[PDB]
A paper describes a structure:
A multigene polysaccharide utilization locus (PUL) encoding enzymes and surface carbohydrate (glycan)-binding proteins (SGBPs) was recently identified in prominent members of Bacteroidetes in the human gut and characterized in Bacteroides ovatus. The BoSGBPMLG-A protein encoded by the BACOVA_2743 gene is a SusD-like protein that plays a key role in the PUL’s specificity and functionality. That study also demonstrated the direct involvement of BoSGBPMLG-A in the functionality of the PUL, as mutations on the binding site and a gene knockout mutation blocked mixed-linkage β-glucan utilization by B. ovatus.
The protein-sugar-sugar-protein assembly that constitutes the asymmetric unit of the BoSGBPMLG-A–barley 9 complex may be a consequence of a high local concentration of the oligosaccharide, which might be compensated by the formation of aggregates, helping the crystal nucleation event. The structure of the BoSGBPMLG-A–barley-9 complex showed an ∼41-Å-long binding platform that accommodated and accompanied the natural bends and kinks of this mixed-linkage oligosaccharide. As in the BoSGBPMLG-A structure with the heptasaccharide, the triad of residues formed by Trp77, Trp350, and Trp353 constitutes the center of the platform, interacting with the internal sequence of the gluco-oligosaccharide chain (Glc3-Glc7). In particular, the side chain of Arg378 makes four water-mediated hydrogen bonds that likely contribute to the specificity by stabilizing the Glc4-Glc6 stretch that accommodates the minimum binding motif.
Author numbering:
A (entry chain B): 40 to 559
B (entry chain A): 39 to 558
């Protein structure tokens, strides 16, 4: 039962179709990885403040997964016969709460979800500073309470109940949060980072302990029942789309150009050019891959600048021999390509059974590399070696978990020895580490946006710099947080007003979170 | 080079010139409120966007090709007793092509057109429209009297295969058309010319076996460069299918669809159907899914396009199609959700390269006779009501005989003619019924359709401003009543252009009524 509550909360993390709209609408534009689909460009790409769209994480987690995890934790707390499920619940509670606070800032946590259990309504919004304090304390204690000789964890879609891997994940999350606070508090950050490395079970040191939620393959449906079906990855469902021929996932130029201009082996693993005239209405079957034809004919790729739609600017196309040939037996096909020259997200990332990414060994290597550049006491491996290991693991992650074609040693070496190289100054090293992390986090948009904001890399420019300033109703600078749902002023007035007063008296998506020291 | 060959080319060019036919899709079909919703039709004619290049198509095409060549051939065969038949046919076709020019622009070169082969005879004067019409009656009368079936064979005639008696019938029927045209501006001359034509050698077109239809061949539609010099197929039908046929097919205007549907017209679903085009060929109307009966069974409203509307504005109310859901099982690109498919489209029978080039029909002759009888002219012993009824029956049978539409039975015809297709009782009711039925007949003859709407005042059409689209009408609120002269004329035929515009007070505006158009 607590074990069943874990299962459902894991499924809801990427399985909730309503919630996943937030990432397509906002995060993927803010990190300049996708742009051109109507939803992504309209909301995040052009800074449309929309309180209902911004509210999806808040409502989803406080009404469902976070609420239920809190209940289950409470019911198993201080029970020596339930220490493993209780500890696992505490780790997952920290994880879900980290998404909330890294989106909105101060928020209910210590007093959350206690109305039925403790008659405690109107929970205060804990200060982000204090939420992060609690993350380190909860994770450390959970690691120390876990005992493999005790209860079996049975509803775990990440590690199949292996509580030693749960210690590795908890200590890796301590690394992530330590590095998160390293601008505002380098001293505490270094201490937390070093403590985690020394903690029981260690950290995730290779991909065999990557934390990935397992999802199944279910046909993509947008009917009403689909909004209560968490069995499939709903982020992948939306990246395919409710309107998949008009509004697929086109890549942003910032990301496509980072890959292409650096010679990254992942360029045409993450993206392809497809003609979709024969594509299924409900799955990415029967697409025509024109990528190699475009390369052979010298046709320029036209990825979407921040602020651009697939149709604005309208691209320069070409006449496809592949499509002309196909039209002979499939007369609905046209040979004239237009928006097909704009790179799209590859089919490997559009599957109901894509994993729900929580944390990878590649990220741990990048965290270790940055801590080493920062002169923390993290071990005997050079920062450069840790960096190279993180890049290799990030590239292999796509092969292992999405079926992308394997990258040879020669291909990796060619890349790492040219534009993927680590660099020779601290700023170049931190730039390379965090640019590589941004690519790794493509399938983890919550972490991708948090790490862009925290590290300041890549250095992203407003859509105004690309010519789209006339559309920026919600202001010029890329938002650094989302606003609280307006109904909170009705359901939780005092606590909401208190949080807003702490920000200076307004709820503004340009206000930096506590751990975010400056913006870009 | 041979005059008989020049006749063939000029006939083919009349509807075979893919560049020139854009004018009808862009302007005429919107001004007569028969098609609306296709981008081109709504943007230009539906929202009064004046564009001199678009308005110039008839002038440029005819004066550089078909009319020029007809004039050359007429000169080469004139005053030669052994060439009287080809010469007379050329004179009749010359009048026909000239009538389209003057009914579009007003005063225009005629007596002085097409010289230049002579010497420095460039810079022709614009003959006054009133005089052009007088010349039409004289030319047609003389050609009828010079024709002699014992003399030269006419060998390249795609209308009548050289049957010169039928050319007499066409010439005298054109005299009826032009006599009725001038019946508001010069009622006494109109009556005299109408009566003279009925009494002339060869008589008029009295049944469908003498309908004047240019025969076109069944060629595949192509929009490549070579297709702009290929006149073998009906290019108006090609354009009504469209260069962008899935995004911008020919949707019907509500004025015309509602006239048909609300009158119980048997032609309603002969001229129009609702289609889902997800599997339709890119270059032909093959593989469309007819949903019309399904909509009727499910009670889904037809949503034809008001004047000024695009297919996407207003966005219509759709439904979920059982037919399409079934087709999606084996054709997964199909969606079952219909949206703009609820807007009636032009039926496939009107989207064929072998659709005839309509010049003049026996149905029109019956409607002209009926109107002349209401006007108390001396036209014979048939009642106006019977002539009207014969006109409607011929107009309906015209679609069966020439477009492959399902035949209308006597019982179906009688049911319509006895109810909402009835002739009516006051003079205004009779004139409205005659000219509303003529408007339907002239659907496949847009030059005549627009002329007769302007001349008769029926149907009574309202500006797109009355349907809510006034904000978009850059070229004025009233529906245009002529097109302006080409900029090529004001640039390179300036003295003659200046003389013509001086007769309109120095103006050259699409709201200025032509001489035969007494009011709007
Ligand atoms: O002629 C011979 C000659 O030819 C030569 O070739 C020529 C050729 O002939 C010629 O045709 C060609 O011309 C080119 C021309 O074709 C081209 O046209 C372009 C044009 O330039 C573009 O501007 C145009 O762009 C369009 C685009 O197509 C549209 O798709 C787009 O539509 C936008 C919509 O997508 C968008 O819709 C969104 C809704 O607004 C929104 O409300 C909705 O919200 C949903 C949401 O998505 C859901 O996720 C959500 O789900 C909720 C959930 O949130 C909650 O949790 O739960 C609920 C239930 O529980 C659940 O419901 O729901 C909400 C609510 O429903 O999302 C929608 C999207 O999904 O809306 C916006 C705004 O309205 C739309 O904008 O619009 C754009 C424009 O705006 O595209 C056309 C193409 O069609 O132009 C070029 C350049 O001019 C031309 O060149 O030219 C060639 C070459 O010259 C030959 O060369 C020659 O040889 C021959 O001779
Ligand atoms: O999700 C859970 C939930 O879902 C529920 O269902 C939801 C669902 O989720 C959601 O997606 C859906 O959202 C709906 C949304 O989809 C819909 O979107 C609409 C939108 O509202 C519209 O506004 C939009 O309209 C677009 C339209 O699509 C475009 O096509 C159109 O494009 C126009 C162009 O077509 C046009 O192009 C022309 C060029 O401008 C012009 O230059 C060019 O000229 C050519 C010319 O044509 C030639 O003839 C000529 O030929 C020359 C010749 O002249 C010479 O002689 O010779 C030459 C060669 O020799 C020769 O070339 O040449 C020239 C060449 O240029 O012609 C072009 C046309 O062909 O350009 C204009 C202007 O730029 C374009 O406008 O634009 C419009 C917009 O303006 O469409 C989208 C759809 O895509 O919105 C609705 C309503 O908001 C949404 O509802 O909602 C559903 C329902 O809720 C489920 O129900 C639930 O269960 C689930 O839970
Ligand atoms: Mg920052
Ligand atoms: Mg008039
Ligand atoms: Na889903
Ligand atoms: Na043609
Ligand atoms: Na008949």
């Amino acid at each position: 039962d607590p074990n069943a509550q874990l299962t459902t909360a894991q499924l809801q993390t990427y399985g909730d179709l309503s919630m996943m709209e937030i990432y397509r609408n906002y995060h993927y534009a803010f990190t300049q990885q996708l742009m051109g689909c109507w939803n992504t460009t309209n909301y995040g790409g052009r800074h449309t403040l929309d309180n209902n769209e911004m509210s999806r994480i808040w409502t989803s987690f406080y009404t469902q997964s976070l609420k239920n995890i809190i209940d289950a934790q409470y019911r198993t707390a201080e029970d020596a016969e339930k220490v493993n499920i209780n500890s696992v619940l505490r780790i997952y509670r920290v994880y879900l709460m980290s998404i909330i606070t890294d989106t909105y800032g101060d928020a209910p946590f210590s007093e959350a979800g206690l109305g039925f259990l403790e008659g405690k309504f109107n929970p205060k919004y804990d200060k982000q500073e204090d939420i992060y304090n609690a993350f380190f304390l909860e994770l450390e204690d959970a690691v120390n309470k876990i005992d493999p000789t005790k209860d079996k964890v049975t509803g775990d879609l990440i590690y199949a109940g292996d509580v030693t891997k749960w210690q590795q994940l908890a200590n890796s999350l301590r690394l992530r949060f330590a590095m998160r606070i390293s601008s505002v508090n380098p001293t505490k950050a270094q201490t937390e980072f070093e403590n985690a490395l020394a903690a029981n079970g260690g950290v995730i040191t290779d991909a065999s302990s990557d934390a990935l939620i397992k999802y199944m393959t279910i046909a993509f449906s947008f009917g009403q029942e689909a909004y209560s079906d968490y069995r499939g990855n709903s982020l992948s469902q939306l990246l395919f789309g409710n309107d998949p021929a008009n509004n697929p996932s086109y890549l942003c130029s910032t990301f496509f150009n980072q890959l292409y201009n650096s010679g990254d082996p992942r360029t045409f693993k993450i993206s392809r050019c497809y003609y979709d005239g024969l594509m299924s209405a409900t799955s990415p079957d029967n697409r025509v891959d024109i990528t190699q034809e475009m390369i052979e004919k010298g046709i320029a790729f036209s990825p979407r600048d921040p602020g651009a739609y697939s149709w604005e600017p309208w691209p320069t196309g070409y006449d496809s021999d592949i499509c002309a040939e196909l039209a002979v037996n499939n007369p609905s096909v046209t040979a004239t390509m237009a928006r097909e020259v704009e790179p799209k997200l590859a089919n490997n990332f559009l599957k109901s059974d894509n994993p729900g990414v929580v944390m990878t060994s590649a990220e741990v290597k990048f965290l270790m590399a940055e801590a080493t550049v920062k002169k923390w006491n993290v071990g005997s491996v050079s920062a450069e070696d840790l960096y190279k290991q993180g890049v290799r693991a990030a590239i292999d992650f796509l092969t292992d978990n999405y079926g992308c074609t394997a990258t040879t040693d020669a291909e990796f070496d060619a890349f790492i020895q040219d534009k993927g190289a680590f660099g020779h100054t601290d700023n170049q090293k931190l730039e390379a580490i965090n640019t590589q992390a941004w690519i790794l986090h493509f399938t983890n948009p919550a972490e991708c946006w948090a790490n862009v904001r925290r590290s300041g890399y890549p250095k992203l420019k407003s859509p105004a710099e690309y010519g789209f300033g006339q559309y920026l109703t919600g202001g010029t600078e890329i938002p650094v947080r989302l606003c609280y749902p307006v109904l909170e002023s009705s359901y939780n007035k005092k606590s909401y007003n208190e949080a807003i007063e702490r920000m200076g008296g307004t709820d503004n998506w340009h206000s930096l979170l506590w751990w975010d020291t400056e913006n870009q």
